Amino acid sequence: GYVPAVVIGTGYGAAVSALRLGEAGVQTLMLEMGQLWNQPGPDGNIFCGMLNPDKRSSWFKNRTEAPLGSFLWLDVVNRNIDPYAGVLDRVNYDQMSVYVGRGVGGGSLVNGGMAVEPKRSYFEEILPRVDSSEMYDRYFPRANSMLRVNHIDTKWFEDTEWYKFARVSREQAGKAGLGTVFVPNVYDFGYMQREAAGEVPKSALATEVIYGNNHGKQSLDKTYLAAALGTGKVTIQTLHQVKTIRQTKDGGYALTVEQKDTDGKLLATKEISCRYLFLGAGSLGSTELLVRARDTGTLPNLNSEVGAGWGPNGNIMTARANHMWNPTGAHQSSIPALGIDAWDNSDSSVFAEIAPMPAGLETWVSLYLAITKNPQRGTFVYDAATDRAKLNWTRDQNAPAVNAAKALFDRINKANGTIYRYDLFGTQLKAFADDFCYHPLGGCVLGKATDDYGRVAGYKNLYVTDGSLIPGSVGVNPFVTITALAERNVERIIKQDV
Ligand SMILES: Cc1cc2nc3c(=O)[nH]c(=O)nc-3n(C[C@H](O)[C@H](O)[C@H](O)COP(=O)(O)OP(=O)(O)OC[C@H]3O[C@@H](n4cnc5c(N)ncnc54)[C@H](O)[C@@H]3O)c2cc1C
Q1: Which residues form the active site?
Q2: What is the 448 CA–ligand 1 centroid distance (Å)?
Q3: How far apart are the CA of 13 and the centre of ligand 1, in A?
Q4: Which end of the chain is more exposed for a tag (fewer CB within 10 A), N or C?
Q5: Which CATH architecture has domain 148-205+315-376+398-434?
Q6: Residue 467 labeled ligand binder
């Protein structure tokens, strides 16, 4: 049937948009292809942990996988599973695997909670058409508050065994003249203290994050989406995947929407129509919908920039072997708290999170997820044969990212007389994982495929809201930027268009 506004997806862009639409009195339906994660599973928990993965860990795979970096210790817990509507989806393209959340809340379900504002001078470089004063004066603060960002207590951090891994890398980086920064988070750090004291059920301190957190983490279902539902003007339908978008003959948009069960069985195909259509299906999902619509003739006026300008936020993973006298600890909080900020906007820039490892025994490994400045971009190209977008990115396009990460970590190795690990990412000697992405950015870039507020070029009342708007790189963990940009966009769209 018809609803005034439809929002596709329930990640950051979608959640912001729906809240503000509902507050404006616009009846809004959100369509989410994954589950509402609120049913206790076979262990009494909603989500599986990293040491006990089961079908809930994976979107339609037949075997669980170890978190990247952890195969040497966590392959032993891998098991065959039924293909199921689980929470984490590794999407495999030719030479890149992109990890995304599937469920009410999108990537907020599976992410590390790290809530980081980009450097203003870098924001100004990547998005020169956007007024940066309103972003920093109004929209970043708005996002910060709504997301429930909080800050770790420094004394507790310094003292606790759960962050020894972070302190070890801080000391090692310091010998190379590199400083660290605390990383704000949406995981409740007060709750985390009480986990360590045995006062509340553990989540971060029980090797949970990437398949969800049963406690502590303020994912979007608890923040923006709960508020959106609270308006009385928003509903969310789950296990509903939008497949096609067209402009109807009488105006507005019509969607074909597949309803499935958690086993992936097709239950129904529905036609849903609306006046205002907001895409929040992510960098991958929104871009796929639009290249499909262009190339199958259902939105024939979409421009040539739809699909273009994708990058992996310069994501590279690497690891160092510590000296025997610098163990990182058997007990590592699953939520990072420290990063190495070596980002000055030059081509050598690196902002690296000091990543915990889940092994639960001493390995002497320090793990890092580097964010780099690499100008290479890929393009999503629709394949009509399979009805899927393909990502034209080649592994050699990550060479500048590897080079920047390696230059930084080489400084740390030189200062400390340490070497890389070469065995964490497969049998072949490989110190730098260069074909994964947790932070997909672009495909429907702001000002290129859209106007400066995400209005899709060629169409009225058609909006993109999410990571597909960002031109490939933000220099930091991206969700705060996506959220703040979505606050800016929806406020303007409601004022001018609704
Ligand atoms: C392992 C991991 C760790 C991360 N850690 C951090 C971190 O600590 N901090 C940070 O800033 N970022 C982090 N990120 C990145 C962050 O989670 C993403 O940048 C963010 O979630 C993107 O928001 P979005 O709104 O673009 O899309 P998403 O959050 O990906 O949401 C898109 C939603 O749309 C749904 N959907 C897609 N297609 C359709 C369709 N056709 N029909 C219906 N529904 C659809 C999806 O199922 C999903 O729920 C991490 C991500 C991962 C995977």
Answers
A1: 353 (proton acceptor), 439 (proton acceptor)
A2: 22
A3: 9
A4: N
A5: 2-Layer Sandwich (3.30)
A6: yes
